[PDB]
Amino acid sequence: LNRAKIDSTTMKDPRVLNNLKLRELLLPKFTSLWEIQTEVTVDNRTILLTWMHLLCESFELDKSVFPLSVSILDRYLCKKQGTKKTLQKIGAACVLIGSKIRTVKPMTVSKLTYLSFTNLELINQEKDILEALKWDTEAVLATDFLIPLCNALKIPEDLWPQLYEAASTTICKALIQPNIALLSPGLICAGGLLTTIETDNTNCRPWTCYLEDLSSILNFSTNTVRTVKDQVSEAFSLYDLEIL
Amino acid sequence: CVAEIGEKVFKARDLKNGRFVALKRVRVEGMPLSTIREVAVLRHLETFEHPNVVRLFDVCTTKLTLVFEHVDQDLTTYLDKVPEPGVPTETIKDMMFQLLRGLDFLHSHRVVHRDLKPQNILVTSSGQIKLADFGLARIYSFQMALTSVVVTLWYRAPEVLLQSSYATPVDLWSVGCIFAEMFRRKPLFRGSSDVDQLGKILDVIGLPGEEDWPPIEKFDIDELGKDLLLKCLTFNPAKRISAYSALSHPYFQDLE
Numbered sequence: 001l002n003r004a005k006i007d008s009t010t011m012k013d014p015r016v017l018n019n020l021k022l023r024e025l026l027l028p029k030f031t032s033l034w035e036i037q038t039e040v041t042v043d044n045r046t047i048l049l050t051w052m053h054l055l056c057e058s059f060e061l062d063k064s065v066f067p068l069s070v071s072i073l074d075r076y077l078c079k080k081q082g083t084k085k086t087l088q089k090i091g092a093a094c095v096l097i098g099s100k101i102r103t104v105k106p107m108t109v110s111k112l113t114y115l116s117f118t119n120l121e122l123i124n125q126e127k128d129i130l131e132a133l134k135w136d137t138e139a140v141l142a143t144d145f146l147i148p149l150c151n152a153l154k155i156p157e158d159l160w161p162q163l164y165e166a167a168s169t170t171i172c173k174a175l176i177q178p179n180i181a182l183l184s185p186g187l188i189c190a191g192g193l194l195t196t197i198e199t200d201n202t203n204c205r206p207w208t209c210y211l212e213d214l215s216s217i218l219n220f221s222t223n224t225v226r227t228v229k230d231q232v233s234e235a236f237s238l239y240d241l242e243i244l
Numbered sequence: 245c246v247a248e249i250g251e252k253v254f255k256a257r258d259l260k261n262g263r264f265v266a267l268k269r270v271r272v273e274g275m276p277l278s279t280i281r282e283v284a285v286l287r288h289l290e291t292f293e294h295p296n297v298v299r300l301f302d303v304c305t306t307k308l309t310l311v312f313e314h315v316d317q318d319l320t321t322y323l324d325k326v327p328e329p330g331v332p333t334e335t336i337k338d339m340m341f342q343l344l345r346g347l348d349f350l351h352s353h354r355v356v357h358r359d360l361k362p363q364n365i366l367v368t369s370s371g372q373i374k375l376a377d378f379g380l381a382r383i384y385s386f387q388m389a390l391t392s393v394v395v396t397l398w399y400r401a402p403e404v405l406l407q408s409s410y411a412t413p414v415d416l417w418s419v420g421c422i423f424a425e426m427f428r429r430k431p432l433f434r435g436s437s438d439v440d441q442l443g444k445i446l447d448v449i450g451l452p453g454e455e456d457w458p459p460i461e462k463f464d465i466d467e468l469g470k471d472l473l474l475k476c477l478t479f480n481p482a483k484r485i486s487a488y489s490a491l492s493h494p495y496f497q498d499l500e
């Protein structure tokens with residue numbers, strides 16, 4: 001299987017960054033995490049999100065399959081009540097749906113059930129999430145912003161493959177944590193690059209030399225950017241499989 | 245339901261109005277990968293209300309029903325019955341515009357519609373373009389995996405055939421093929437295999453030099469369309485024009 005390579009239309013066109021900024025405003029900002037929820041909690045999510053991420057990491061899915069599943073799941077869990085038991089059926093349906101959209105070889109029902117509820121109950125749960133959201137499943141993922149933000153930042157084009165791999169990875173683990181769920185996709189992403197550029201010492205400027213321009217680019221204050229970096233790096237650091 | 249308009253795509257009326265709608269009763273791993281993709285994109289972009297992309301109205305569920313806006317006819321029926329000498333001069337310039345417009349739309353939202361064919365392209369009574377069937381369509385992130393099977397044989401861009409990785413220029417290929425078919429009311433390239441098809445093509449565009457590798461009036465066109473059509477069928481896909489760059493090209497400046 002061959003991979004999508006640079007496309008000026010899709011990554012260097014300045015109105016792609018613009019339109020991302022826009023459709024970012026089509027996912028209404030969550031008041032608080034899982035407000036509509038009486039039983040399960042944020043604690044129950046960091047876990048399930050952790051399994052889900054692993055399930056996405058272990059089966060080598062495209063980097064943008066886990067952000068979408070997290071997005072779907074939260075959204076579904078505004079418009080429906082879920083138990084502490086079903087909570088795993090649910091998150092396994094989200095990966096089922098999210099894979100079908102953002103990845104060429106989907107997770108199957110077998111792989112999702114053989115390791116976890118029946119092959120029918122899960123399908124019916126794909127249904128339930130499909131209805132509840134009225135099939136409006138896609139979304140703007142923190143991942144969608146990496147390359148347009150790299151172009152915007154005049155980062156030398158040939159550093160993109162490594163930075164994409166590093167940062168998309170740092171991003172996806174953060175997304176497991178609660179306090180990252182409130183931040184806006186563009187910002188979560190900006191943190192990703194900075195958290196990463198800092199670490200790897202990639203032949204860029206040092207990361208603080210991208211703060212005043214990421215401010216400009218995303219239209220936030222040079223303080224919101226710093227906090228979003230810190231928050232993200234921290235959420236990365238908070239990753240623990242022994243939580244399972 | 246009344247009379248099928250697609251191989252399964254129906255045609256019926258509604259309890260609200262007896263207005264015209266298209267029904268797509270999709271026969272159901274859970275829900276088919278493709279329809280989930282199709283709908284997901286259409287609802288993602290719908291509030292932008294672009295002139296050139298069919299609207300979707302509902303879904304419901306064993307069997308599944310997918311409900312759209314109705315269009316007079318597909319460009320296939322159009323070209324197959326438009327009074328001689330076929331589509332007029334400027335109607336042609338015009339639909340090329342709307343096509344490249346609804347496709348400048350799409351790509352700017354990081355979407356690729358890789359199933360561009362006159363079977364799929366729609367034409368309202370007022371002569372407006374409505375792009376349809378978004379089964380093979382999806383958001384292009386970077387370093388993402390790809391199947392090796394998009395577009396019906398005749399409209400498939402080279403590099404796809406060459407089993408290379410594709411992108412947006414896949415859309416522009418079919419465009420500068422539908423650009424072609426429009427003038428000469430019959431498919432420009434009619435192969436039988438991935439290799440025949442790459443031949444029918446390669447014995448026209450000619451032999452791409454060592455750098456581009458991984459008469460045209462010959463086949464009634466303006467001097468200007470014939471730079472556009474060459475721009476949309478330049479072998480190298482990093483050389484193929486972009487729908488944005490094309491919308492601005494000189495063939496278009498005289499227009500409604």
Ligand SMILES: c1cc2c3cnc(Nc4ccc(N5CCNCC5)cn4)nc3n(C3CCCC3)c2cn1
Pocket residue numbers: 248249250251253266268298312313314315316317318321363364365366376377
């Ligand atoms: C969503 C919406 C639509 C849609 C809405 N209207 C029409 N109108 C239409 C087209 C063709 C004909 N003719 C009838 C006599 N035989 C030749 C053709 C008549 N009406 N076709 C639609 N399609 C078609 C794309 C390719 C197959 C289904 C859609 C696909 N997705």
